[PDB]
């Protein structure tokens, strides 16, 4: 069925599963035409397909050529997403195929179910969590590979870098969702927090900076503060009056 | 005009004959139904006065034999039977008409309702849906499940309607997933019509039989089947013009005949709003849309 707060731990069990987010598949800029009308220009997008236990990210780059000459692009994008996730599953050895695919948006359910009819034993599920995977395009190295692509392309990343050598996947997913939520709420400030310190760098084969455990605790704190700060700026709330119980709920409530 | 003789009516019962109904009291001098129009299938149905549970009944065609009803006190129901002895049959039949112990099938001459509800319903096709080959008539009741219901339990006592499932490999061509799901023309025209039903007449007969079993017995699986067969057509962009026009007529008479007080349970709000206002055929069902909007505007 649906995935929510009652079954958080199921994401980090040994049943292979993937999250599929389609929010960056069909991307456009809206602009005025010479005649004063409005038109869209597509730009490259990506499917965000993630194993939350391992960090493996199957990033299918959606080149703008896939939209050429097509109608009803927002509808097509859901089916294109489903087609590509299906092709990925079929490309994987049987013992690597997922037992469950969790879609972040319920509009993906029927497209993916239909494309996966050949896999009756793979469960297609929605989720009540509001996961911030849209902010993936705020990770500089992901945004770069998407915008530079001149053709359809699949790129593989581990979105946890080497974190799993030191922390569990429940903690790694918590860190990733906190980072993505912050980048989604205030991207400039989140990148400022992450990159303000020259002495901490991003390894060539990593997405995030090489923080020590203690620095990650500092970074995570600065991200919660950013989420709380924006929360107050948004609703005109004096954050100083807020209690720790109120804060957990505000930050936890965002996802 | 043909006759269905009742040995007797030992228990108080509401008797249906097609779209008509009448009450018979416990041990009342009732010996059956006369003047039944030759040329149509018919349904004789029952609801016991002391236990409205289990409506049940028999589809039959008087051209296929001489049929009568006799109560079975062991199984507790009015059973249809066939009388092979033609002269015994005509003889008993004549005795009860001479005594006026029968109700007359009450067909008004202006009225084409029954024809318009059963135009495409054939006894031979009923007997493939309701499997009991030793009898020429077919028993249906309120609780019988459909083959699809059993997939989602006794197989001998099931309604073997044609399985329709929009998220099935039969409905969806590999490589045409979005096309086939958003426009069901392939599934309707190639899989169902050409492949399974062979022609639209057989498709409509199943649709009409499913409607009648939903209406007369409150058979839920039949109601599901009737709505699936409507939705399949309405969700196809390419339907022969003659099928659309016939479907409009078929549905018009069905909505016209439905008891107003059963509309909340026999009409699926989602399916009808989709079909009438969002589907490819939203503008092709003029008569059905007009009667629906004037008779059941709440549902929409
Ligand atoms: C382990 C948990 C992590 N989670 C979160 O969303 C945590 C979170 C909430 C607000 S900012 C970060 C999704 C379910 O699994
Ligand atoms: C066998 C029984 C049948 N019965 C009936 O009344 C029912 C009947 C009518 C025509 S054929 C059967 C009278 C005595 O003979």
Key phrases:
heterodimer, A: 255 residues, alpha/beta, Nucleotidyltransferase, domain 5, Acyl-CoA Binding Protein, 6-stranded mixed β-sheet, two-stranded antiparallel ribbon, 37% helix, B: 300 residues, alpha+beta, Serine Threonine Protein Phosphatase 5, Tetratricopeptide repeat, 5-stranded antiparallel β-sheet, 3-stranded mixed β-sheet, 12 helices, 10 strands, 41% helix, elongated, binds 1-[(2S)-2-methylmorpholin-4-yl]-2-(thiophen-3-yl)ethan-1-one
Largest sheet of chain B: 5 strands, antiparallel
What structural category characterises the helix and strand content of chain A? Answer: alpha/beta
Largest interface: A-B, 11 and 8 residues
Number of domains of chain A: 2
Largest sheet, strands/sense/barrel of chain A? 6 strands, mixed
What's the CATH architecture name of the domain at 116-299 in chain B?
Alpha Horseshoe
Q: How many beta-strand elements of chain A? A: 8
Proportion of residues in extended strands of chain A: 15-25%
What's the name of the CATH homologous superfamily of the largest domain in chain A? Prp8 RNase H domain, palm region
What's the CATH superfamily of the domain at 116-299 in chain B, by name?
Answer: Aar2, C-terminal domain-like
**Please, how many helices of chain B?**
12
State the shape of chain B.
elongated
CATH 2nd-level architecture of the largest domain in chain A: 2-Layer Sandwich
Q: Strand order of the main beta sheet of chain A, please? A: 7-6-1-4-5-8
Q: Rg of chain A from C-alpha positions?
A: 19 Å
Structural class of chain B: alpha+beta
Pfam family, one (chain B): AAR2
Modified residues (Phosphothreonine) (chain B): 257
Function (chain B): Component of the U5 snRNP complex that is required for spliceosome assembly and for pre-mRNA splicing. Involved in splicing pre-mRNA of the A1 cistron and other genes that are important for cell growth.
Region (Leucine-zipper) (chain B): 244-265
């Amino acid at each position: 069925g649906a995935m929510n707060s009652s079954n958080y731990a199921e994401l980090f069990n040994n049943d292979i599963k993937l999250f599929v987010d389609d929010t960056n598949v069909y991307r456009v800029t809206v602009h005025k035409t010479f005649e004063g009308n409005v038109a869209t220009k597509a730009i490259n997008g990506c499917i965000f397909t993630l194993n939350p236990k391992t960090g493996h990210l199957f990033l299918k780059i959606i080149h703008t050529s896939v939209w050429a000459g097509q109608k009803r692009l927002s509808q097509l994008a859901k089916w294109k997403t489903a087609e590509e996730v299906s092709a990925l599953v079929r490309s994987l050895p049987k013992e690597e195929q997922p037992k469950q695919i969790i879609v972040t948006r319920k509009a993906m359910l029927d497209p993916l179910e239909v494309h996966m009819l050949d896999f009756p034993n793979i469960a297609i599920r929605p989720t009540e969590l509001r996961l911030p995977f849209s902010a993936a395009m705020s990770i500089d190295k992901l945004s770069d590979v998407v915008m530079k692509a001149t053709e359809p392309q699949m790129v593989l990343f581990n979105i946890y870098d080497d974190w799993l050598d030191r922390i569990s996947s429940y903690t790694a997913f918590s860190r990733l969702t906190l980072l993505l939520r912050a980048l989604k709420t205030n991207e400039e400030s989140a990148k400022m927090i992450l990159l303000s310190d020259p002495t901490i760098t991003i390894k060539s084969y990593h997405l995030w900076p090489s923080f020590t455990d203690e620095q990650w605790i500092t970074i995570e704190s600065q991200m919660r503060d950013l989420i709380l700060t924006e929360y107050g700026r948004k609703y005109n709330v004096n954050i100083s009056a807020l209690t720790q119980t109120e804060i957990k709920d505000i930050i936890l409530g965002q996802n | 005009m043909n006759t269905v003789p009742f040995t007797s009516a030992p228990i108080e019962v509401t008797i249906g004959i097609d779209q008509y109904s009448f009450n018979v009291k416990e041990n009342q001098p009732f010996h059956g139904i006369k003047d039944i129009p030759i040329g149509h299938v018919h349904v004789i149905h029952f609801q016991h006065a002391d236990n409205s549970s289990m409506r049940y009944g028999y589809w039959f065609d008087c051209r296929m034999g001489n049929f009568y009803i006799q109560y079975d006190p062991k199984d507790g129901l009015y059973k249809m039977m066939e009388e092979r002895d033609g002269a015994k049959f005509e003889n008993i039949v004549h005795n009860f008409k001479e005594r006026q112990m029968m109700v007359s099938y009450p067909k008004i001459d202006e009225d084409d309702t029954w024809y318009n509800l059963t135009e495409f319903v054939q006894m031979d096709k009923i007997r493939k849906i309701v499997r009991k080959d030793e009898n020429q008539f077919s028993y249906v009741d309120s609780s019988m499940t459909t083959v699809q219901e059993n997939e989602l339990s006794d197989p001998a006592h099931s309604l073997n309607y044609t399985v329709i499932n929009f998220k099935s490999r039969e409905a969806i061509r590999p490589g045409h997933e979005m096309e086939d799901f958003l426009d069901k023309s392939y599934y309707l025209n190639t899989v169902m019509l050409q492949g399974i039903f062979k022609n639209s007449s057989n498709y409509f007969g199943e649709l009409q039989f499913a409607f009648l079993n939903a209406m007369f017995f409150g058979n839920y699986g039949s109601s599901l089947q009737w709505h699936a067969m409507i939705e399949l057509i309405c969700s196809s962009a390419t339907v022969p013009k003659h099928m659309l026009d016939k479907l409009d007529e078929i549905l018009y008479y069905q909505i016209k005949t439905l008891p107003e007080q059963y509309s909340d349970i026999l009409l699926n709000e989602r399916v009808w709003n989709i079909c009438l206002y969002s589907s490819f055929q939203k503008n092709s069902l003029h008569n059905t849309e007009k009667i629906m909007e004037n008779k059941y505007p709440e549902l929409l």
